[PDB]
Structure formats: C-alpha cells, structure tokens
Amino acid sequence: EDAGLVAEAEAVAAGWMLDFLCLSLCRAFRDGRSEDFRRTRNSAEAIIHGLSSLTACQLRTIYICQFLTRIAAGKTDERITPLESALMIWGSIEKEHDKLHEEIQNLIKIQAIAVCMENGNFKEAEEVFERIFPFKSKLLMIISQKDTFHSFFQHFSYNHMMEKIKSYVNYVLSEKSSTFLMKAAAKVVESKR
Amino acid sequence: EDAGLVAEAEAVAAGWMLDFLCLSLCRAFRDGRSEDFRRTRNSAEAIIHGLSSLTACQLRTIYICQFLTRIAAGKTDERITPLESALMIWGSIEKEHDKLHEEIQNLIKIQAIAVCMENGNFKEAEEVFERIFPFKSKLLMIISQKDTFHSFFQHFSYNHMMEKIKSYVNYVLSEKSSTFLMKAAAKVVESKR
Ligand SMILES: OCc1ccccc1N1CCOCC1
Ligand SMILES: OCc1ccccc1N1CCOCC1
Fold first, then answer.
1. Which segment of the chain is annotated as a signal peptide (chains A, B)?
2. Are A105 and A91 in contact (CB under 8 A)?
3. Which chain B residues are Cβ-neighbours of A51 within 8 angstroms?
4. Which CATH number fits domain A3-76+78-191: 1.25.40.210, 1.10.260.100, 2.30.40.10, 2.60.40.420?
5. Three-class SS of residue A32?
6. Cα–Cα dist A85/B24, whole Å
C-alpha cells in the first residue's frame, strides 16, 4: 500500500465528515437540540484536526461552526465573552455584507451587553460596551441604571437575534443538504422504509 | 422534513465514520504514527457519542479502539494502569481465544509489571503483580531485586508484545479495509491520479 494515497483518502473522508457535521450542527441549532449540538460540536472539533490544508469552502465551513458554537454559548483565555467572539468571527467570514449580515451583527452587539445584564453582572456589561463601542451615551445610561427591560433591549432582543441567525442557518442548511455523506446516508434510510 | 428519518441518516453516517476511524487508528498504530493515532482516537471517541444503540459488530469495533488506546498509553479514576485496563478489555471482547489471543494476553500481563520497572516505580510493579497474579514467586523475586533485564523479561518483552498485537491489528485492518467510507475515499483519490 502507498502511505501517500492512504493519507489522501483520509483527507477526502475528513472533508466529507466536516460537511456532514456542519449540516448536523445547523439542524441541532435550528431545532434547539442542545445536547445533540454539544455532541456534534465536539465531533466537528475533533475531525477538523485531520485537516492541515483547507480550501476556501472548508475554511468558511469551520468558521460557520465556530460562529454557531459561540452563539450557543452566549449566556454560559480570550479576555472577552462568547458573543463578542461570535462578533469577531462574523465580521471575518468570507461572506456578503448584506441587510441580513448587518442586522445579525447589530443584534449580537446589543445582546453581548444584555446577556451580562440578564446574569446580574452590570460591571461586565459596561466592560463589554467599552470593548464593542448620543446613541452610545443612551446605551451607557441604560446599563448604568440596570434598565434591562428598556424598549431598545426589547426590540434588539435575544429571541430576535436567534430568529435572524436561524434564518441564516437555513441558507447554510440548504447549501449543504446534498453533500456526499448525508445524501448517501439518506439513500440507505429510504431503501429500508 | 422528517426528524426521525434525519436522525436515522445521522446514525448510519456515525456507523460509517466509526469503521473509517477504526481503520485509520489501526494503520497509525501499525505505522508508529503517534500524533496521528492521538488525533484519530479523539475523533473516534467523539463520533461514538452519536450512537446510543450499537450492534454486535459496532461493539467489537469500539472495544478494539479502546484496547489499542490503552496499549498505546502503556508507558505513559480506574485505580489500575493502562496495560491492566487493556487486559480487562482483551479478556472481554467477543472474539476467539486462540493461540494468538493467549500469547497477547500473557505478554500484556508481564509488560504491565515491566513498564513500571522501566519507569523506576518498583512499588507500583509489586502492586500491579498483586492485582494480576513457583512461577509467581520467581516473578515476585525478579521485581523485588529490580532485575528489569532478567531473561524472562527479555523473552516476554515490550517489542514482542507490540509485534504480536500488530499481527492481530493486521487482521482487523484487512477485515475493515473495504468499509464504505474508505472505499469511496480511495475511488476519489484513484480517479485524480
Ligand atoms: O474550530 C473547530 C470547531 C469546530 C466545530 C465547532 C467549534 C469549533 N471551535 C473549537 C475552538 O475554536 C472555536 C470553535
Ligand atoms: O470509548 C470510545 C473510544 C473510542 C476510540 C478510542 C478510545 C475510546 N475510549 C475512550 C474512553 O474509553 C476508553 C477508550
């Protein structure tokens, strides 16, 4: 056997497993299946170590997986919070900066502050505000007055952030719905049955 | 979409990934590729969480993976050493107890003591001997006298244990060489080249 050809076959399979795990992570995030998301995330993290060179499409895929991971950890080394880390990933992905990208970005910026207020850490909410940012002065008075349920926070809510991110996840889910591993697995299931 | 049929497709794919990772772990163990073995082991461990019901063949597969993991950690919660744990797995696998099974078993029993002596922990070597076991009295005097290079230890050596386990790994490697994921990955590589 040729070790080089064996290593090449292992790299192709890693690529297939990555797309499968991304598609599975997207569904668990859309469905609210938290433990399934955690298991799929751990699997994707492990599989991604079998790839040392990634194509442009594979890089976009791992960054979507990292993004959804921080968003899922939003309310639960970097010296920043998970939502501030999701914001850094979001602004760096090789993707179009359309209306949806912009509204997801702004919802994360406000939710990175609001999740700290929800947890009762108002000093942390101020530190998050200083790192991200008359609008700023109003937002700073809201945090200072512990006005968690201010109408602004209700419009740029957590549920609205999740709905917008889930709409983006549906496009990713559609784009990868037909990848090799899932398509072959569906055929085996449909043949039984 | 049917969530049940999606979950079934995900279980089929997990089964395929398990066989692929087992075959990859077997090759890394045979080749002495330590970091590749560590990466594949972490991937197999993660993938195995996506299966809650395992067939008789899948159980045998995960136990071979656990066995090779302890053997690989032999010289590096349970209150026993990795080689004593490999011995517990080995004696429990749904497999034939032939001449090869017996010689692998005895080589592990002696190496579980000898690796402690190699590391300079003779008190631990005595604790391992007491847990596993005129032959016993001779083996106990060897440990007590720190006779690490005694002719008995040279016949039931680490290298001999590794060669015997590698011969067993070659049968597993042959049995799984044709599994779905590796066979499809090889076709893509051969078509390029
Ligand atoms: O990067 C691999 C990856 C795959 C899937 C899900 C999450 C991750 N990461 C792990 C650490 O980096 C940030 C999220
Ligand atoms: O059990 C899953 C598994 C798969 C592959 C390699 C090792 C393991 N384990 C992890 C813990 O149990 C003992 C080795």
1. none
2. yes
3. none
4. 1.25.40.210
5. coil
6. 34
Residues B181/B185/B190/B191 CA torsion (nearest 10 deg): 110
User: The tokens of A147 are what?
Assistant: 């006005």
User: Please, which residues have CB within 8 angstroms of residue A15's CB and are 6 or more apart in sequence?
Assistant: A51, A58
Contacts of B20 in chain A (CB under 8 A): 13
Whether residue B45 and residue A45 make contact (CB cut-off 8 A), yes or no, is no
Name the token pair of B52: 């809650």
Evaluate the CA torsion angle B33, B36, B39, B41 in order and state its sign. Answer: negative
State how far the Cα of B91 lies from the Cα of B102, in Å rounded to an integer. 10
Cα separation, A184 vs A190, whole angstroms: 10
A65 lines ligand 1 (CB under 6 A): yes
Q: Where are the domains of chain A?
A: 3-76+78-191
Structure tokens at A113: 């502050």
Find the length of chain B. Answer: 193
Token representation of residue B3: 């969530």
> What is the C-alpha separation between A124 and A135, in angstroms, rounded?
20
Q: Cα dihedral angle (B35, B36, B37, B38), rounded to 10 degrees?
A: 50
User: Nearest-5° angle of CA B92, CA B94, CA B97?
Assistant: 80
Experimental technique? X-ray
Spacing of C-alpha A81 from chain mean position: 14
